[PDB]
Amino acid sequence: LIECRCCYGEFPFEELTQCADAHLFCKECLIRYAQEAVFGSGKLELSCMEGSCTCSFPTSELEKVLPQTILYKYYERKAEEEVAAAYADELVRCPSCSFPALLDSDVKRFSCPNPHCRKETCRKCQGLWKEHNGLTCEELAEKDDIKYRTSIEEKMTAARIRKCHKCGTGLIKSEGANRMSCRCGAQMCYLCRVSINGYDHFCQHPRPCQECSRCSLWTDPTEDDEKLIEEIQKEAEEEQKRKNGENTRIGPPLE
Amino acid sequence: MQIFVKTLTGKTITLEVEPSDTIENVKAKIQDKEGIPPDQQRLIFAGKQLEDGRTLSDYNIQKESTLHLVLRLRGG
Amino acid sequence: MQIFVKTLTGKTITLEVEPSDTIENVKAKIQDKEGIPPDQQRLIFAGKQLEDGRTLSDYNIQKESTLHLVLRL
Amino acid sequence: MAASRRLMKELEEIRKCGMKNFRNIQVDEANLLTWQGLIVPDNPPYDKGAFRIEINFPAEYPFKPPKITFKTKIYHPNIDEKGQVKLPVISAENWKPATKTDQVIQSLIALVNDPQPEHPLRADLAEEYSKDRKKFCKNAEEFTKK
Ligand SMILES: [Zn+2]
Ligand SMILES: [Zn+2]
Ligand SMILES: [Zn+2]
Ligand SMILES: [Zn+2]
Ligand SMILES: [Zn+2]
Ligand SMILES: [Zn+2]
Ligand SMILES: [Zn+2]
């Protein structure tokens, strides 16, 4: 009748697991903990859930309890965060094979080295470089409806999804302050999308702030981003109708 | 139709769906092709959350459109 | 000593090297094993860029440790 | 749900071991994700009043931290005018799922007892506390009374 310290349910010894400090948890709680760490908001290191334990769950218990897919994705995310700690947010994956590669962020000629891929693309619009010659991303998108619709959809996405400057993960705010702490350990601002250095980035003058030009901590940029998305949609429809030869919406309903 | 899905790590997976397929089916295919539990999948299309009650046609998701998986992070 | 080098696609190439082997030697072995030119290889251990002048014992790369391999232009 | 099991257990443990400075705990058994209660501090400058607070647990609890909001106004460097608190032990970056509400409340009471003006939400009050605690304490006593 051993009681798990996380979910508080009672189980036998066979349905339990431990860390290096012999803390007892149920296997399902460890599974959900690893799930929140991998496919959710949580720390990478699967540390022992108890604060008194600086140790973590041993890799043997992880390989015995966690399913194969969860463990594989955990190793993948560990590699992702190590790449983030190494070369920051300069790793780009090919649009055709997702093969990661490093570039100086000054050249857009991403030639996928994978012999099963080897596709020349443009890292700004994911467009083919042989067509992209002599033309900008705007023009290459306007040269086709399949390109332009997807480009407008991606613009509307980027108008809301905020990328992390470390692991490159996309974030949205459910509620609370405008300070975002990513699951990789990097902090950013939800108003300026800049990697902040702490709480000295926001304004703390509650007495309209005309003593510092710093971002507010509680302002909701929901309406501004929504209006920008709607304007992108409307202007894209206008452009399509203006360069459509008597031809026939790009994006979800605007509510 | 062929659509794409951006995972939280940043990879692009390819899905083959129908306009009448629901967000539940889309998340199930995402789980089959990557292992992400649908309860932890937060989907965004053109800056709009994809609710399970609706369907792809309710969001005007056409061919070669790319959905994105993002984090529903709190504020502090 | 046996170490592992995991690439970005997930390929785990096993290497037999000594703890006092330079990262330049490790990248040369990676080249003659897979074909990746050393001027394009970037090895990472615990989030630190491994310099071609340091050695496996400088970063204290122990037995059966994993090194993440990324590619440059 | 794990959240429901864990919060019913924690509530059953609090109802047996009542907390000293956290009283009048109200939780609808039909919605375990919101708790209301009264913080009753022991020391000046806050020990002449009490403060209503609310705890909101995410559906993913205990794998994500709760949030605490003060409903009563309080004069404190680490609590803003809307009652939001940045209690480090329940920050997303520090959160451990084994942390229980009794520890969260103890941490909150320790913060109330000893402000941390180096990392404030109200820099004015943090400056006043760090420069002249006697003055800060008088201001806080008056704010508690009012
Ligand atoms: Zn449990
Ligand atoms: Zn432990
Ligand atoms: Zn490629
Ligand atoms: Zn381009
Ligand atoms: Zn990140
Ligand atoms: Zn900002
Ligand atoms: Zn200000």
Numbering used by the authors:
A (entry chain A): 512 to 718, 723 to 763, 766 to 772
B (entry chain C): 1 to 76
C (entry chain D): 1 to 73
D (entry chain B): 1 to 146
Article passage:
The RING-between-RING (RBR) E3 ubiquitin ligase family in humans comprises 14 members and is defined by a two-step catalytic mechanism in which ubiquitin is first transferred from an E2 ubiquitin-conjugating enzyme to the RBR active site and then to the substrate. In a subsequent step, Ub is transferred from the RBR RING2 active site to the substrate in an aminolysis reaction, analogous to the mechanism of the structurally distinct HECT E3 ligases.
Similarly, the K63-linkage-specific RBR RNF216 is allosterically activated by K63 di-Ub, but not other di-Ub linkages. Like HOIL-1, UbcH7(C86K)-Ub conjugate binding to RNF216 RBR-helix is not detected in the absence of allosteric activator, but preincubation of RNF216 with the activating K63 di-Ub facilitates binding of E2-Ub with an affinity of 1.3 µM, whereas addition of K48 di-Ub had a less pronounced effect on E2-Ub binding (KD = 4.2 µM). We were unable to crystallise the RNF216(C688A, pSer719)/UbcH7(C86K)-Ub complex with K63 di-Ub and instead directly mixed RNF216 RBR-helix (C688A, pSer719) with a 1.5-fold molar excess of both UbcH7(C86K)-Ub and mono-Ub for crystallisation without further purification. The RNF216 asymmetric unit comprises a single complex of the RNF216 RBR-helix, UbcH7-Ub and the allosteric mono-Ub. While the active site details are clearly resolved for the HOIL-1 complex (inset), weak density for the RNF216 complex means the isopeptide linkage between UbcH7 and Ub is not resolved. Like HOIL-1, RNF216 features a helix N-terminal to the RING1 domain that in RNF216 contains a predicted Ub binding motif (motif interacting with ubiquitin; MIU).
